[PDB]
Each structure stands twice: as C-alpha cells, then as structure tokens.
Amino acid sequence: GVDIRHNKDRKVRRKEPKSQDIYLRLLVKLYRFLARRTNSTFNQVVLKRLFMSRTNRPPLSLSRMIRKMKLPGREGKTAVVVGTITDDVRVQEVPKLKVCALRVSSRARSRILKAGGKILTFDQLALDSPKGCGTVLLSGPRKGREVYRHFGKAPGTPHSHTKPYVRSKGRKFERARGRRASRGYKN
Amino acid sequence: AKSKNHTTHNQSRKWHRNGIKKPRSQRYESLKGVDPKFLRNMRFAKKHNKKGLKKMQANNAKAMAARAEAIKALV
Amino acid sequence: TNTKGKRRGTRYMFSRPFRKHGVVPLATYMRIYKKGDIVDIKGMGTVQKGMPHKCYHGKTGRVYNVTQHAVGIVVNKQVKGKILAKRINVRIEHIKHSKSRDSFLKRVKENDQKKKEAKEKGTWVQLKRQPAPPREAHFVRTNGKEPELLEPIPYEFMA
Amino acid sequence: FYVPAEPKLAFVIRIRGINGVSPKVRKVLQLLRLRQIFNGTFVKLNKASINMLRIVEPYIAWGYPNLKSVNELIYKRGYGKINKKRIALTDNALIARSLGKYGIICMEDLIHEIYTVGKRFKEANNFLWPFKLSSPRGGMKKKTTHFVEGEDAGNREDQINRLIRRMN
Amino acid sequence: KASGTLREYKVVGRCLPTPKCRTPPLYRMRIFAPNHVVAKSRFWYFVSQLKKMKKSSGEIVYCGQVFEKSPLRVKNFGIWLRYDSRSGTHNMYREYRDLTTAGAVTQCYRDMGARHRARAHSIQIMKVEEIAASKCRRPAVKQFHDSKIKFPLPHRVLRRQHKPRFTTKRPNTFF
RNA sequence: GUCUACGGCCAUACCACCCUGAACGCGCCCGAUCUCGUCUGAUCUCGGAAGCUAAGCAGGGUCGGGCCUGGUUAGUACUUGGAUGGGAGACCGCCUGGGAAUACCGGGUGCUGUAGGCUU
RNA sequence: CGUUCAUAGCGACGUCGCUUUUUGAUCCUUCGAUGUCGGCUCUUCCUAUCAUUGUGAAGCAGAAUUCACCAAGCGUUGGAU
RNA sequence: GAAACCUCCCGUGGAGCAGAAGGGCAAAAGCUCGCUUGAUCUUGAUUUUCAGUACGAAUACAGACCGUGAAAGCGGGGCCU
RNA sequence: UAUCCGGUAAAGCGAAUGAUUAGAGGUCUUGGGGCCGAAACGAUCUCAACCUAUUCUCAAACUUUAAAUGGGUAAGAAGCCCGGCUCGCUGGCGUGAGCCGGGCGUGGAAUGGAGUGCCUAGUGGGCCACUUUUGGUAAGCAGAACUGGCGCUGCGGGAUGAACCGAACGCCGGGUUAAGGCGCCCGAUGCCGACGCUCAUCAGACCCCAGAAAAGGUGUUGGUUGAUAUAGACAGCAGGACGGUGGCCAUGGAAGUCGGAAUCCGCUAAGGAGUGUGUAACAACUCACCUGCCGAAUCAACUAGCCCUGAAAAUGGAUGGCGCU
RNA sequence: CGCAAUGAAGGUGAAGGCCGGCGCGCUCGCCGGCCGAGGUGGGAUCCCGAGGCCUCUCCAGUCCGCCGAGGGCGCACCACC
Ligand SMILES: [Mg+2]
Ligand SMILES: [Mg+2]
Ligand SMILES: [Mg+2]
Ligand SMILES: [Mg+2]
Ligand SMILES: [Mg+2]
Ligand SMILES: [Mg+2]
Ligand SMILES: [Mg+2]
Ligand SMILES: [Mg+2]
Ligand SMILES: [Mg+2]
Ligand SMILES: [Mg+2]
Ligand SMILES: [Mg+2]
Ligand SMILES: [Mg+2]
Ligand SMILES: [Mg+2]
Ligand SMILES: [Mg+2]
Ligand SMILES: [Mg+2]
Ligand SMILES: [Mg+2]
Ligand SMILES: [Mg+2]
Ligand SMILES: [Mg+2]
Ligand SMILES: [Mg+2]
C-alpha cells in the first residue's frame, strides 16, 4: 500500500480539437508535426490553440490588431490569430498588414486587402515560416463575454460589482431590500 | 428524538483536503481604507508629477553622462 | 451554547500583569510605526479605546495605515478552512514592534558587509545558514584522575 | 579518550504500513519519500533532520550505514529519477546525464557523494529513487516497539547494517 | 530493556562542556545489556536519575564491552537489586553461582521473572560483586561449597522421544 | 565627586529606624501691598531673603523587611509520541523526547539621556 | 451485647462484595402488530436447605434448639376473604 | 455612649465607579465644584456574530458646527464586555 | 534558527481571595460563664472573637509562580544600496508618502510541477477506539475535544465478531514478511531448546474480551528487618510463682484478678502491685529467672510470587474443542 | 436580442493628453498646432543580438547552423494607480 492521492493525477487539458470539421483537423495534422519536429514554441502555442473552444478563442477586432502592430518595433511582421479577424467600424485608416487567421469576416477582409494587406491561411503561414519566425501572436480579449459579468463574489455580498441574473432591468426588478439603505440594508 | 448537538469531528480533515491555502499575496495592494486626508494628498502629488518632468529628465542625462565619464576613467 | 460577547474569556488576557497596573508608561505611545512595519498585537486592559478582539491577541501582522493615534494592521486569521488576511484598527497601546524581522535584517546587513569584502580578496564565504551539524571528532583527556563510578541508589520509602 | 565524530549520514527504513497514521507523521514520512512500507532513503543528519526522524520514530527503523551497505543498496537497487521515470542505473551515461553538472559521472562518484555526504549530496540523494527493499528475511523482532526495548523501530545506529543485508 | 544473554559494558560519559564548566567530570557505570545500542540507552537512564544530565546535554565518551577476567573459574556472585513489585519497590541481595558476571546477571533476570514475575524494565541492578566461599548468605549456593562433592543423576528422564516415535522397547531411566 | 530642571526604563529605585552632608543648588523659612484663593495667607497665588540644615532631599548604615538575580528543591512534579507492558480496578513501570514551582541557602540593593551648575 | 467473656449466638462506627426472584436508570431489538394480569393445568432446572439422610456448634443435662457443613434424592398440603 | 461633629496618624485601593460577574481604574475612570450639550449634522473604511449576509453593538479616520481647557488635548453618549 | 502570544498540568497558600487543624504568644480587644474575690487589666482559670511568630490540610467559577504539547510572524529581487523629481498632507529647517533613473543576485533543512475560473451532484440521522473531558452510583447511558477508524472496505490474525492488532485489494508464478502461531483438530518445534515457579475434591492457559474484591493461609518459594545461642541455647517434659500487702481508688465486692490512676522496693535465682481460670471475696489453679536430660541451629515480625479460602442460579457446556501436569 | 449607461423621476449620458498662444498659467477661463484610448509590476511569445563552437595545416574570408550572455517590443490575463 502506497500513500498518494490519485485525486489530481489526470490532467484535464485538451489533446485534439473537439470539433469534427476536416479542414481544421488537417491544420492540426500539420501543426502537430511542426510542433514536434521544430524547436519553435510558436508552433506549440498555435497547436494548443487549435484545440480550444469558440469561447476560448475570441474574435480579434481590426482596431485591436492595428494598435498591437502600431507598437514600436514590430514593423514589417505578420500578426497571427487562431480566432477570427473582425471589422471595426470605429476605425477608419487601416495600415497595410500581414495577417494569419482561421477566419476573417468579409468586411475585415475587404478593408485589409484594399489597404494593400496580405491575408494568409495557416497552411500558408507554415510554408512562409515553419518556426514562427517574425510573427506577432495576438489574442482576442478572453474576458469579453457578457458571461463574466455574472462571475465572481456574488451580488449582495459587500464590495461585489457582479451583475445579477435578472429577468428584465427596470425600476421594479431588484433595487429594493438590499440595495437601498432605505430598505433594510445595502452591500 | 434528540440529536447530536454540535461537533467539529471530521472538519480538520475536510479543510485539509484542499489545503488551507495562505491568502494570495500580491505586490501592489489597494489603498482602500487608508486615512482619507493622506489619499487626497498622494493623489495630488501624483497629479503633478508631470509638472517637474523636464527638470527630472535632464538630471538623469547629467547622471548618465557622469556614469559614462566614470566608466571611461575606470577603463 | 456560549455567549457571543466581544470580551468573553479575556479575564486573564486583558489584565495587566502582577505589579504592572496603572499608568501606561510613555515610550509605548511615543514610538513610530511606518507603513509595512511588522507588529505584534497584544491587547491591554488599561486602554479600552481601540482594543483589538481576543482573536488577534498574540497574532503578528503588518501595518498598512497610520492614523493620529492608532495603526491599521493587516493580520491573518484562520477560519475553519480558509485563512483571511484582514485589516484591523488597533490603538497604539496594544502593539509592539515585532523583533522577528530585525534578526533577519541584521543578517542581511552582515551579508552585505561580507559580500563587499571577500570580493576583492577572491575567497567566497558562506552566506547561507546551516543547521547544527553533528558534533565532530575530538579527544577527551581523563587527566590523571580516572572516571567516577555511579551505582544506582537503593530504594527507600520517605513519606 | 577518542570520541569519534557523530555520524553524518543515516539510512531510514519505513517499517510500518500506511493505515491509521497521524497527519504530522504522515507528512514527514512523505518528506523522507518513505511512502510504501519497506522503502528506505539516505538522510544527512543535523538538528533539523534528526528531529524530523524523532517525530516519525515508531514508524521507522534507521541508523548509520556501512560502506558496504551504500554499495549494496546502490548496485543492487540503484534507480535514477530521470524525467520523473524511475529508471535503473544500468550505465553511467544515465548518472552523468543528470548529475554530471556536479562532477558526478559514474556509480562510483555517486557512492562517494552519498557516503561522505559531499557538497552535492542533496542532488545525488534526490536523484536516487527511494529504495524498494523486500521484506526482512528471518523476520523482525517486533514491529511496534523500539529497538532499545526489543522491537525494530527507532535508531539502532550500527545495527542498521544487519537489517540492510537481510532486506537488500 | 529485554534480554538474551547479557554482556557487561563499560560506559563512561560526561555532560558536554560549556563556557562556564570547561572540563566537566566523567561518570562511568557497569551497564549489562544485550548490545551496546541499548547499553548506551541504559547508561543514560541511570545517569538521568542520579545527575542532572540527559542524552541531549551529554556525550558518551567510551562505551566498551568488558570481558570476564576469569571465565574458566567457577565463582559465586553477590548481586544487589532494586525491583518493582505489583505493590511497592523493593531491595534484594541475590546470590548466584556462575562462570561470569554477565552470566550471573543473566541468571538473575531469569530468576526474578520466575520467582517474582518481575520483568526486565522493573529491575535495577546496583552492584554485582564476586564473593568468597564465606560471605555467601544463601544456602542454595552454600551446598556446592564442598571438596568431595558427590551426587547421582537419579531418575534420568529421556529426551529423544521422537527418535523412535514408536518402538517395541519400553525405555530405561536407570543409569 | 555631586547636584538642579525636563526625563527613559519603573522597588537592585519600596518601607522602617540610625548616622553624615563642603560649595553650588533644592528646600524649609519671613511677609500679604498688589495677582489669586481660602472658615483659616495651613494649602493655593503673590513679594521677599533674617535664620537654619531640625525636616524634605542626597550618600551611607542594618547577620533589617521587601524587591532583583543565582543555587537547591530535582531530572522530582508534570508532560509530546510508543507497545498485544503490568495491574481485578484504582493506578504504576519502561521506552521516546521536553521539563517546572515553594520551603531552605547564597549574592545584589538603581542604571542611565538632554540641558545647566558647584567641587574654580 | 451476651450476669462474667469482643466473636456460643450477636454486632455499632467503618469497609469490601455478589445477585438479577424488587424497583429504577437506559432505549440496543421489535410499531406491513412477538396477543397485553392473574388463576387453572404440566414439565423441568436452581439453591440462597423449611423437612427428610449423614455430620461439626452451642450460652447442647434430657426435651426443645438455634449456628454451620456435605447435600436439591424425596417432599412442601386442605380451606375462609 | 459601639454610631453624630472636629483633629492627628497609618492606609496599593482592602472603597467607589447605576445593574450580573469578570477586567480596568488613585495629583483617576472615584468624590466635590465650574462651564457645557460631541447623546448634534454627513460620507465611506473596519471589527464583532458571520455565510464571512443582515440586525445590534463597537474601532479607527475624514468633512461640518460646537463644548471645554491657559494650553497640549480630550469629547460625535454612558471605562470595557 | 530567531521572535512574540498563553495562564492548563504541576506548584502555592510562613504571597492576595476564600476555605481550614493545632498548639505556643498576646489584660491588644472586650466580653459572656466561672472559681478565690464587697469589688478591683487584683489572683486564677476559661471560652469568644481579633492580633505576633509558627503549624495541619484545601479551590472548576483563587493565585505570587509556572511547564510539556500548542498559535502567530520572519528566514530577500515584491530585497538591499545610491541619485533626483511631485504634494492642496505635515512642518522652525524637516517629515511622510508617491513618482522617475541607475547600481548590486542562489541568502536555513527536507519535499514537491504550480496557479486560476466556471458548471456541479450526493450529503446535512451517524457511530467506535487511544488520550483529555462534563452530567450520572453506573450503563453496550447521555454530552464535548483531539487524532485515527467503521460507515464506503475486502484480506492475515483475535475460535465466533462493524470498530482490536497486522495490513488496505487489476488478473497470475516464485520468493519474504507482519500481527499472530507451531500436541492433535490445523500450515509450523517430531529442538535431546535454557532457567525457575506452581497441584488446585472450582487448577491454569494471552490487547480490545467477555469476568471478581476486602480480608485470610507454617500451602510452597523467594526477599526485608530484627534477633538468639556454647556465659552450649531452642522447643519437648520436670521444680517454684513469694513477701512490704486487704498496696491505692473503688464498699457492691477486687487483699494480682467487674473497671480505672498507679505501678516501686525487699528477698533476690526470681516471680507482674499481675496473662488468664474462676470467685460475692478469697482459696485453689494457671501464665518469668534458673537448672536435669537430650544435641545445632533456632525464632520473630513484615513483605511479595504461584496455589488455596473468600467464591451462590436457574435447558446440558464450553482456555474454541479434544485434551494437557 | 445585441451594439450604453445611470437616475424614483424631471432628465443627463462615457477623452484624454500634449504643445504653442491669448486671459495674471490663477494646478481656473478662452484661442491655434500635434498626438490620440493612460501608466506600474508580472507576462506565453516575437525581435535584436556580444560571444563562442568547429572546418585535414597558417592566415584571409563570405555562406550555414547550434547554442546564446545581454537588451527590446510586449498578446491574453491578473494585481495596483
Ligand atoms: Mg480511488
Ligand atoms: Mg444532526
Ligand atoms: Mg498500535
Ligand atoms: Mg505663609
Ligand atoms: Mg536636611
Ligand atoms: Mg540631619
Ligand atoms: Mg535583605
Ligand atoms: Mg460487657
Ligand atoms: Mg428494561
Ligand atoms: Mg408467537
Ligand atoms: Mg449450600
Ligand atoms: Mg463615568
Ligand atoms: Mg470631528
Ligand atoms: Mg482558562
Ligand atoms: Mg491544579
Ligand atoms: Mg436525513
Ligand atoms: Mg443516542
Ligand atoms: Mg448510511
Ligand atoms: Mg493498525
């Protein structure tokens, strides 16, 4: 008899993508290979991200991709995003970029290409740079989802600012006993 | 039909399954609950740090030049 | 079921020791705590304004705030399964500087002395501590006189 | 009189099982890597270490190993910890690969680091996977009582070597 | 303590030196035990009682087995005890007749178990002294002090009862 | 050597009685016009400077009490961990480490910071 | 106490036990039910022996007797309320 | 007169401090005077019960307007529970 | 390794609080009762409370002391050390805080990959053991602490068994163990095992556990302490047991003898102002000191081992059984 | 439904910086230019890279790597301002 807890012996990370789609799965076959045979950890990070959920690979807006490449020095590079590239209607002038993405929305595609931008697929990125050399690996804001505003220290727990799940906002949906001082108390 | 009234029997065990973790220390803790009169004044001090910038930058350049003269004298 | 009262069971804790009642002698008040001073809390009966709760007596923690005549002081209090770092506003009279940290600072100062010197020399010196090692080989001279014999003594009933 | 040095190093065998064992003991027993019954480890002695053995006394038999004991344990049951896989020290290419950054490049070097308790003891001793020894041939005296008082537990100093031979 | 057959051990030790007491006095004992390991322990037990001195506070200097200097002489040993009864603690003076001190103390430990159901850990041996023909107070010893000693081995009951487990011959016990 | 003013730690500094105190201080001391306050110039407040160390104060003394600190008490009482140890129980012994408290007997009996005197 | 005599028979103040034919404690079992008092009838066991056999004791002269031992073989009844 | 009032001495609190008890308290936290309304107006922070929600109770501040004191200060109820 | 916290065990009561024994000392106070006093701190006692040293014995809701086990912190890069700026705070000047800019690396042992977020079921009757512990005569009773069990869990041992001891299970071969054993049931002593103890007309025979105490016993075995005796004892039989003396108190009779204060001398070889028997009371009898014989050890009081008495239940019966000396 | 909140409501409704000038730069008011979602610490990852390390010789010497001390841009995310 041995004393170990077998409690957290199984690591819960993903191995493959849970999706069954065939084009992504080909990318996975390609980046598994590169991951293992190259020294590049870029390939490993990319590989890891191909297995993740929709939630877990959030969309990267065009404006966010602009400003991250506006940063000093990462000039004449390629931005990479395992998610999708979306438009920003609240940005106007779009520099000529180099981009990798699993998806780019039709607007975002036009705007970039009109600028003299190049768009790449991930099979194309590999041939272009199999060890991820000269890349900017970005990500969309993970904690964008409105979901997260309900997460945390519960509402009605002093110093929480945590959206309650409520049928409809309005004068008479919550905001009585436990928010006003006038009505019982407040947190 | 009287019960058991209270105990703490299996509780230490229960607590230590998942550790009894020490409270996660960060650097840069908040200034929540600090004497208001202080906080006003450090806020104002922070407000005007950009005033007295041009002086400060020059002073560091003069320091950097003095360091470069010292390292040249050493070598 | 016991009473939840604040001062329950502090008959002995908050009670000035034997022949140390009366005026809180003045050093106590007139010594300075900054931010981040390590400070051990020890409630006192004479001063009842700003007393800590019986749970924080004995406990050490760091100063975070300093008001006119008190000191905010983060201390860790365990609660069944979870340790809660929490911030309490003790009046000075219930608080000393904890020396626990100073012996450390003494050692780091001594290290900085022993790092500056022994750099130009070249001989590197033991900066880390080391636990008490087994007590080495050595001779014991039974100088002239032989060993003293110890017979165990015969029992007898005294009372 | 010549009072020789108090010993540096001691072998520590876990001599009772893994049921109904106090939490303070249990923790120390898994700070000596003595998880299974009849696992053993070398252990350098000092005020800290010795007292940890004091807190687990009726759970272990231990004492001061011979030279031969260190050889027999290392050669017959010498297993590296090599990428967290218990692997038998079949060649020095294994020892070197791991401990060669300390000047330890062979089984022999290892034995000298363990036995003299060198600078690099911690790293050579941790490299060794804890020694899975068999049951004590010829049996024990009494599991539950101390050596001094007839049993097997506790410090038996010189006599840990007899036990080693009947288990290794 | 337990047993087997004991060995006299000499164990000398000292409360280890300090600033205040630079060269402390050595204390020696006669500690009968199956092995040095428990000898040293037994040394510490006796010293703790007598002197303010513990295993932490001291160092054993010289533990060493002590050999009977006249093994092949038959001797008479006086041995003074200090046992624990179920009731109060006692003193005795036992006498044994043996070739050795060790043998004579071993002999004692067995007797005490027999005659008083006294277990090792209860018994304190204080002095063991070899003794003349005279100064022997116990008649169980005294009967063997005689030049022309003469006795038979009368009803010589057999062993080897299972060499022939079965046999024709009823045995013999006269010799 | 020592004092005064403001002190820190608060009896090794307290209490009792006894002796001795140069100089400068500190006092007691002599007054109530004014300030101030009392039933009362006792205290308090104020203006003094003839006396005196009697007292306070200091320094010392006592096979002094007290306090402070060692020994002893004692590896005793207690105690962490151990056993298919004992014992009808009550309790006890061992192993493993930790370890006190009176009575009794010694020694000690304020140290010192800042500012200013005096012994020129 | 027993004239006298602690102990033939007793036995205060104290103390140590056994017993489960008293009553309590307790609530483990049974609430998809174990028929709830007494008497009648019948068998068997126990002994902590009333009698009967064999015996030790006496404050046993005899008679009557209580005290104790072996001992449960055999008995231990008829009625009024 | 054992007890009225006055006076001298000793007095570590053996009294008193609304109430239970515990703590605390002596040129006070007691008693006696003088002046008073901090038991007033207003944000948050924190403690205690705690789930670390409420209530009550409390702690440190901060901003007003006052009180009192030569002043330093103390005071937003009751020495603390 | 440093450093704080503590008021439980113990200890203490010639330290506080409360309890409490005894005598010394004290007209402290004063008394109430006396005896000798008219009365008198006069003399003599006394008991009350108080006090001066001592003294006996105590405390969950007392304590001057004060453990063990125990709870905080700390043991470095978020750290040190320089340079300069910001402030409506603080202020003789200075603080203190916040900012920039440089300069310096393992800072006790042992071990281990860490962090972090979402959904979330069952559960919310518990029980058992060590130790601590409250109520109760106690309980296989009721109630807490601490750890570990059982519940959820098989396996070896404990005959049998929730929970004891050992040990924790994928399916199998070889080896070795634990706790337990080894007459036969039943794997192993079919050892030329070692040394003792003990005979029971109720023997005894292994944690939890299934059963006995006080008190006894020249039963036997050990101790401890004291004797004794050649100035030849010790028992075993044989010879005397007196006088001063109806001693004194007690008369109801105690000249040794219901009881009690006494309690010595003579003769002495030596006999107690008497161990008992018994007497109304004597008497009479009986119980040292010494010899005669015999011929070496003798005898007392404790103590602890086994054994025995103490020891009584109902179907016939259980060291598990058979049995065992 | 989402892309805007917050207030009981009448309603209001997410930009800041810098520079130069003009009003007294008054840490306030008005006029021209430039940048345009702030900063600290940690951050997978990219980027630069002294310097090795050899090549069958003594040096020259572009090409290719391997490592890389040191230094940078810093996603997401977290904590703080
Ligand atoms: Mg599992
Ligand atoms: Mg319940
Ligand atoms: Mg055990
Ligand atoms: Mg006057
Ligand atoms: Mg004077
Ligand atoms: Mg004088
Ligand atoms: Mg003195
Ligand atoms: Mg009578
Ligand atoms: Mg019943
Ligand atoms: Mg039926
Ligand atoms: Mg009978
Ligand atoms: Mg008041
Ligand atoms: Mg205010
Ligand atoms: Mg308590
Ligand atoms: Mg106690
Ligand atoms: Mg339920
Ligand atoms: Mg129940
Ligand atoms: Mg269940
Ligand atoms: Mg177990």
Q: How far is CA D13 from CA B38, D56, D114, E172, in A?
A: 61, 11, 16, 55
DSSP-derived secondary structure for C44-56: -SS--TTPPPTTT
Q: Is D10 exposed, middle or buried (0-12, 13-18, 19+ CB in 10 A)?
A: buried
Please judge whether C150 and E91 are an interchain contact, meaning their C-beta atoms are less than 8 angstroms apart: no
Helix (H), strand (E), coil (C) string for E33-69: ECCHHHHHHHHHHHHHHHCCCCCCCEEEEEEEECCCC
H or E element at residue D155: strand D154-155
Contacts 24+ apart (CB under 8 A), E17-24: E23/C143
Question: How crowded is residue E6: how many other Cβ atoms within 10 Å of its Cβ?
Answer: 26
Please judge whether D30 and A2 are an interchain contact, meaning their C-beta atoms are less than 8 angstroms apart: no
Please judge whether C147 and E59 are an interchain contact, meaning their C-beta atoms are less than 8 angstroms apart: no
The C-alpha atoms of residue D161 and residue D140 are separated, in whole angstroms, by 14
Please judge whether C154 and E82 are an interchain contact, meaning their C-beta atoms are less than 8 angstroms apart: yes
The C-alpha atoms of residue D129 and residue D95 are separated, in whole angstroms, by 12
The C-alpha atoms of residue D148 and residue A161 are separated, in whole angstroms, by 66
Interface mutation vs chain B, best among C34, C62, C63, C64, most B CBs within 10 Å:
C64
Q: How far is CA E127 from CA A96, E29, E116, E132, in A?
A: 105, 10, 20, 16
What is the CA E118 to C1' I157 distance in angstroms?
Answer: 28
Contact between A51 and A27 (Cβ < 8 Å)? no
Question: How crowded is residue A79: how many other Cβ atoms within 10 Å of its Cβ?
Answer: 21
Does the CB of B38 fall within 7 Å of any strand I atom? Answer: yes
Q: How far is CA E85 from CA A72, C90, C157, E110, E115, in A?
A: 93, 61, 14, 16, 11
- Number of helical H runs and strand E runs in chain E: 3, 6
The C-alpha atoms of residue C80 and residue C124 are separated, in whole angstroms, by 48
The C-alpha atoms of residue D131 and residue C137 are separated, in whole angstroms, by 30
Q: Which tokens belong to A33?
A: 């290979």
SS3 (DSSP) at C97:
strand
Q: Is E36 exposed, middle or buried (0-12, 13-18, 19+ CB in 10 A)?
A: buried
Q: Is it the case that chain E and chain D have 3 or more CB pairs lying under 8 Å apart? A: yes
Contact between A173 and A166 (Cβ < 8 Å)? yes
Q: How far is CA D63 from CA B68, D123, D125, D128, D154, in A?
A: 62, 21, 16, 19, 8
Contact between A82 and A140 (Cβ < 8 Å)? no
Contacting residues for C9 by C-beta, under 8 A, at least 6 apart: C54
SS3 (DSSP) at D100:
helix
Question: How crowded is residue D70: how many other Cβ atoms within 10 Å of its Cβ?
Answer: 20
Q: Is E109 exposed, middle or buried (0-12, 13-18, 19+ CB in 10 A)?
A: buried
Contact between D26 and D53 (Cβ < 8 Å)? no
The C-alpha atoms of residue A16 and residue A22 are separated, in whole angstroms, by 13
DSSP state of D153: B
Question: Residue for token digits 């034997």?
Answer: C18
What angle do helix axes D67-77 and D160-167 make, rounded to 10 degrees? Answer: 20
Does the CB of B24 fall within 7 Å of any strand J atom? Answer: no
Q: How far is CA E90 from CA E3, E93, E123, in A?
A: 22, 11, 10
Please tell me the total number of residues recorded for chain E in this structure. Answer: 175
Question: Residue for token digits 């604040």?
Answer: C6
SS3 (DSSP) at B27:
coil
Contact between E66 and E34 (Cβ < 8 Å)? no
Q: Write phi, then psi, for E110 (nearest 5 degrees).
A: -75, -45
The C-alpha atoms of residue A31 and residue A131 are separated, in whole angstroms, by 11
Ligand nearest to the CA of C68: 13
What's the CA dihedral at A132, A136, A137, A138 to 10 degrees?
Answer: -170
Q: What share of chain B is helix, strand, coil (3-state, %, to 5)?
A: 55, 0, 45
Interface mutation vs chain C, best among D9, D43, D46, D53, most C CBs within 10 Å:
D46
Specify the pairing of strand D9-14 against strand C148-149: unpaired
Q: Which tokens belong to C36?
A: 């981040």
Closest CA to A23 of A127, A121, A129: A121
Contact between A140 and A83 (Cβ < 8 Å)? yes
Q: How far is CA A22 from CA A18, A19, A25, A29, D121, in A?
A: 12, 9, 5, 10, 54
Strand I contacts (CB < 7 A) among C residues 63-82?
75-76, 78
Closest CA to D101 of D124, D118, D78: D124
In terms of phi and psi (left: phi > 0; alpha: psi -120 to 50; beta: otherwise), the region of E38 is: alpha
* E 26-85 residues with CB < 8 A to D: 35-38, 41, 59-62
Q: Is it the case that chain D and chain C have 3 or more CB pairs lying under 8 Å apart? A: yes
Question: How crowded is residue B7: how many other Cβ atoms within 10 Å of its Cβ?
Answer: 7
Question: Residue for token digits 């779009």?
Answer: A94
Contact between C150 and E43 (Cβ < 8 Å)? no
Q: Write phi, then psi, for A64 (nearest 5 degrees).
A: -70, -40
| HSE-CB for E92 with a 13 A CA cutoff | 22
Q: Write phi, then psi, for C60 (nearest 5 degrees).
A: -105, 150
Please judge whether E46 and C140 are an interchain contact, meaning their C-beta atoms are less than 8 angstroms apart: no
The C-alpha atoms of residue D68 and residue D76 are separated, in whole angstroms, by 12
Q: How far is CA D165 from CA A87, C98, C144, D65, D140, in A?
A: 76, 53, 44, 11, 13
Q: Which tokens belong to C68?
A: 């006119």
Nucleotides of F under 7 A from a protein CB: 7-11, 72, 74-76, 81-87, 92-99
The technique is cryo-EM
Q: What share of chain A is helix, strand, coil (3-state, %, to 5)?
A: 30, 15, 55
Does the CB of A22 fall within 7 Å of any strand J atom? Answer: no
Contact between E10 and E30 (Cβ < 8 Å)? yes
Please judge whether C82 and B21 are an interchain contact, meaning their C-beta atoms are less than 8 angstroms apart: yes
Q: State the alpha helices, DSSP H only, in A102-178.
A: 106-114, 122-128
- Strand ranges of the sheet holding E9-15, from the earlier edge strand across to the other edge: C148-149, E27-30, E9-15, E58-65
Closest CA to A1 of D37, E148, D112, D127: D37
Closest CA to C55 of C96, C14, C98: C14
Nearest-Cα residue of chain C relative to residue B8: C80
Amino acid at C3: T
| HSE-CB for D98 with a 13 A CA cutoff | 24
E121 contact D CB<8A: yes
Q: Which tokens belong to B34?
A: 């600090």
Q: Write phi, then psi, for D60 (nearest 5 degrees).
A: -140, 155
